[PDB]
Every structure is written in structure tokens, then in C-alpha cells.
């Protein structure tokens, strides 16, 4: 059934599972035409497929050419997502295939179920959590590889960097979702927090800066403050 606050620790047990977020698959800019009508122009997108225990991110880049000559693109985007996830599962060795796939949006349930009919033992689940994975394109290195792609491409990254050497999966996921929630609520401010101190760098093979344990506590506090601020700025409180 649905994944929610009550069964939250199941994310970090030893049964392989993947979150799938389709928010950023079909991306457009809306603009005016010479005649004064409105049109869309697609840009490259990505499927965000994440193992929350290990941090393994399977970033399937969706190149604008996949939309060429197609109709009802927002509907097609859900089926293309399901096709690519099913292809990913079939490409993995049996002992690496997931036992559950959790979709962040309920409209992905039927597309993924139909594409995974060959895998009756893989459970397709919704979630009641409001996860901030849409903000994945606020991570500079992820956005860069998506926008530079000239063809369909899969790029594999650990979204936790080396954090699991020092903290548990539960704590790593909590840090990730706090960072992404901040970037989603006020990207400019969040990015300022993360880079204000130029002496803390991002390793070539990492996504986030190389904070010490003590610096992560300060950073995490600054992100919470940002989120509460924006919540006040928004609602006036």
C-alpha cells in the first residue's frame, strides 16, 4: 500500500527499492508566437530514479527529440517514464532488481504497473509523502548534464556523496530531503547558504560541498531557518 509517515523506516531496510519521480521528464518554456498566440518549446528532461538506502541515482536523460511529432505529451511522458524504468529493471542483474518501486505521483501507478507486468513480484506503490525531488534540477551538476545532452543518455551518481561513511541512510535521506526542500522553496537563498564560504569546495566526483560534521549541523540549521522564513514570508506569520 501507500508509503507514509507511519512506515517511514521501511525505506532503509535491506529490501531493494527505488523511488521514481517523473516531475522533470517533460519540461517546456511557454512563449508568444509572431501572431500573438502561445506555444511551448521543450527542453531536455530527466527521470529521477533513486535507491534511498544506498544513494544510487539512475538519472535517465530525456532528450527533446523523443517528443518530436508526438501528441498529448504530458500523458506520453508518464508512459515513457514507465518504459524507461522497466528497461532499467530488466538491465539490472536479478539480485539487484528492486522488490518495490515507489512513485512520487499517483498518475504513474497504472503506466508503471502495465510496463512491469513481466515482474509480478515487484510491488508498485504510491506515497503520501510530499517529497521534494522536483528540485533535482537545482543541483548544478545534474542540471548541467541534462541540458548538455545531445541524445538519450543514462548517468549514474551517488546523491549522498560519501556521507554514508559517517552517517546512516535514514540521516542521509533526511539531509537530502531538507536540502531539496530548501532549494525548492527559495533556490537563490539555498544556493547562497551552500556556497557562501568559498573555502569549502565540491569535489570533482561529488555533488555537494565537503562539509565537516560540524559544518553540516550549521548548514542544516540554516536550511531549516530558510524554510521557516519562506513559510512566514509566504503566509505572513
Amino acid at each position: 500500500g501507500a508509503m507514509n509517515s507511519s512506515n517511514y523506516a521501511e525505506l532503509f531496510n535491506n529490501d531493494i527499492k527505488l523511488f521514481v519521480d517523473d516531475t522533470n521528464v517533460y519540461r517546456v518554456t511557454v512563449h508568444k508566437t509572431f501572431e500573438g498566440n502561445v506555444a511551448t518549446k521543450a527542453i531536455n528532461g530527466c527521470i529521477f530514479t533513486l535507491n534511498p538506502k544506498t544513494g544510487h541515482l539512475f538519472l535517465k536523460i530525456i532528450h527533446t527529440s523523443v517528443w518530436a511529432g508526438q501528441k498529448r505529451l504530458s500523458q506520453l511522458a508518464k508512459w515513457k517514464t514507465a518504459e524507461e524504468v522497466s528497461a532499467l529493471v530488466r538491465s539490472l542483474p536479478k539480485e539487484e532488481q528492486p522488490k518495490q518501486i515507489i512513485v512520487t505521483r499517483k498518475a504513474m501507478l497504472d503506466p508503471l504497473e502495465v510496463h512491469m507486468l513481466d515482474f509480478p513480484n515487484i510491488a508498485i506503490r504510491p506515497t503520501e509523502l510530499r517529497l521534494p525531488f522536483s528540485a533535482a534540477m537545482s543541483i548544478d551538476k545534474l542540471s548541467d548534464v541534462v541540458m548538455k545532452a545531445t541524445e538519450p543518455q543514462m548517468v549514474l551518481f551517488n546523491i549522498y556523496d560519501d556521507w554514508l561513511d559517517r552517517i546512516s541512510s535514514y540521516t542521509a535521506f533526511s539531509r537530502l530531503t531538507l536540502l531539496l526542500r530548501a532549494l525548492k522553496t527559495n533556490e537563490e537563498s539555498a544556493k547562497m547558504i551552500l556556497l557562501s564560504d568559498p573555502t569549502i569546495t565540491i569535489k570533482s566526483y561529488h555533488l555537494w560541498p565537503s562539509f565537516t560534521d560540524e559544518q553540516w549541523i550549521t548548514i542544516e540549521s540554516q536550511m531549516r531557518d530558510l524554510i521557516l522564513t519562506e513559510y512566514g514570508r509566504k503566509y505572513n506569520v
Partner: protein, 300 residues
């Protein structure tokens, strides 16, 4: 015109014959139903006064034998049986006719309702859905489950309707996932019509039989089957024109006949709103949409 006699009526019961019904009192001078139209299947059904639980009854075709009803005080129900001695049966029925102990199948001549509800229903197909090969007639009741229901428990007592499942490998061609799920024409036309049913007449016959079991016995799995078979047609973009026209007539008479007071439990809001207003065939069911809107505007 044929006759289904009764040895007696020892317990108070409401007896149905097709869309008709009458009350018989405990030990009332009752010997049966005469003047039953030849050419159609029929159903004779029962609801005991003392336990409205379990409606039950028998599908039969008087061309296939001489049938009668006799109460069994051990199993506690009215049982259909075949009389193999034709002379004995004719003589007993003739005496009953002479003593006017039989009700007459009360068919108004203008009325085509029963033909319209059973147009494609054949006894031979009924007997493959309801497996009991030693009898020529078929028992159905309120509680019998379908093969599909069992999969999700006594197989000898199941309704073996054709399994329809929109999220199954049978329904979805590898590589045509989105196409086949959003337009079920290949499942309808290749898998079901060409493959399993062979022709639309047998498909309509099972659809009509499922509705009638839902209506007369409140058989929930039959209602599920009826709606699935409607939805499979309406969710196909490509359907022979003759099937759509016939479907509209079939559903019209089903909706017309349904007791107004059972609409809440025998009609699936989702299926009907999808079929009449969202599906590919939203504009192809004019008679059915008109009777539904005037008779059950609440559901919609």
C-alpha cells in the same frame, strides 16, 4: 407452448419466471407454469418467505427435455428435475391443465422484453459457464462466485465467465503498452472476439447472461462481469458498426428492465459515466444514454 410443472408447494415462496413473479402460500393447490414461449431460454427462480437470503433458480430451454420442480425437504429447496417418461409427464400435466392448478406465463403480445434480454443467450453456452453436465438445466444462486473472483473457493460451484483483466499480459501486447491500455481494440477484436468468443453473438450472449444473473439473483460477480464486458467495448476505438448498434439496444432493454430500487447496487457509477461521457463510444449509445439520463440522472 411448454409447461414446467410443480409436484407441490410445501413452503411459502416468491416464484419468478423470467421478468414475472408471484407469491405462493405454504401448501397452496399450486402445480406450475404453463404457456411458456418456445424459442427462448427461460429462468425459474425462488425466494423463500422465511429466508430472503439466497435467491436461487434454474436456466432451462423446454426444447431440450421435460422439466418439473419438486421441493426437497432435506436440502430445503425447490429442485428442477427432468422426467424421461414423456407419456407419464404429458398425462400428469394435462390433468393439471384440466384442474386449472397452473399459472399462465403472462406474455403481452406487444411485448418483446424477454426476447430483447435473451437475444444472444444460448443454453449450450450457459451450460459451459455453469458446469453440471448430468443436467440439461443450470442452477444459479446469489452466492456463487466467479472463476476470476476465486483467483483473487469450491470450483464445482463457480461461474466460469470469461476472464477480463485490463492490466494483464493477455490485454497488453509487449511493446504496445500505452497503446493497448488506452485503446483496448486489440484485446476486444483479436483476443476476445476472434480468439475466445469466435463472434460477437457469443460475446453478447455472455454479457446478457451476466446481467440477468446480476438482476435476478443479486449475484455480485455477475454484475462485475457485465460491466467489464461493457467497458471493454466502450474503451475500444475500433468496433464493428453493427456491434455498437446492437450494444445500444442490448443495454437499453437492460436499463429499462432493472428495478428502479436496485439501481444503487447493480450499476457502477464509474463504468457508466466513463462509457457514456468519456469513452471512445461516448456518442455511439444514444438510446442507452437517453434512458439512463431520464431514469437514473442521480448516478450521473
Amino acid at each position: 407452448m411448454n409447461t414446467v410443472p410443480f409436484t407441490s408447494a410445501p413452503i411459502e415462496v416468491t416464484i419468478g419466471i423470467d421478468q414475472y413473479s408471484f407469491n405462493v402460500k405454504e401448501n397452496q393447490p399450486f402445480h406450475g407454469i404453463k404457456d411458456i414461449p418456445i424459442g427462448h431460454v427461460h429462468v425459474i427462480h425462488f425466494q423463500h418467505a422465511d429466508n430472503s437470503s439466497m435467491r436461487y433458480g434454474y436456466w432451462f430451454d423446454c426444447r431440450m427435455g421435460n422439466f418439473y420442480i419438486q421441493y426437497d425437504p432435506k436440502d430445503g429447496l425447490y429442485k428442477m428435475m427432468e422426467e424421461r417418461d414423456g407419456a407419464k409427464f404429458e398425462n400428469i400435466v394435462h390433468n393439471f391443465k384440466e384442474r386449472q392448478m397452473m399459472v399462465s406465463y403472462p406474455k403481452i403480445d406487444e411485448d418483446d422484453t424477454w426476447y430483447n434480454l435473451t437475444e444472444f443467450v444460448q443454453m449450450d453456452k450457459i451450460r459451459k459457464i455453469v458446469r453440471k453436465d448430468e443436467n440439461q438445466f443450470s442452477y444459479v444462486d446469489s452466492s456463487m462466485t466467479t472463476v476470476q473472483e476465486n483467483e483473487l473457493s469450491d470450483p464445482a460451484h463457480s461461474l466460469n465467465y470469461t476472464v477480463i483483466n485490463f492490466k494483464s499480459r493477455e490485454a497488453i501486447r509487449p511493446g504496445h503498452e500505452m497503446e493497448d491500455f488506452l485503446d483496448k481494440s486489440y484485446y476486444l477484436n483479436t483476443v476476445m472476439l476472434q480468439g475466445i468468443f469466435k463472434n460477437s453473438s457469443n460475446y453478447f450472449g455472455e454479457l446478457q447472461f451476466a446481467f440477468l444473473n446480476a438482476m435476478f439473483f443479486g449475484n455480485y460477480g455477475s454484475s462485475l462481469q457485465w460491466h467489464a464486458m461493457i467497458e471493454l467495448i466502450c474503451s475500444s476505438a475500433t468496433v464493428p458498426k453493427h456491434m455498437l448498434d446492437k450494444l445500444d439496444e442490448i443495454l437499453y432493454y437492460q436499463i429499462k428492465t432493472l428495478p428502479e430500487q436496485y439501481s444503487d447496487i447493480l450499476l457502477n457509477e464509474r463504468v457508466w459515466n466513463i462509457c457514456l461521457y468519456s469513452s471512445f463510444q461516448k456518442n455511439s449509445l444514444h438510446n442507452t444514454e437517453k434512458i439512463m439520463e431520464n431514469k437514473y440522472p442521480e448516478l450521473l
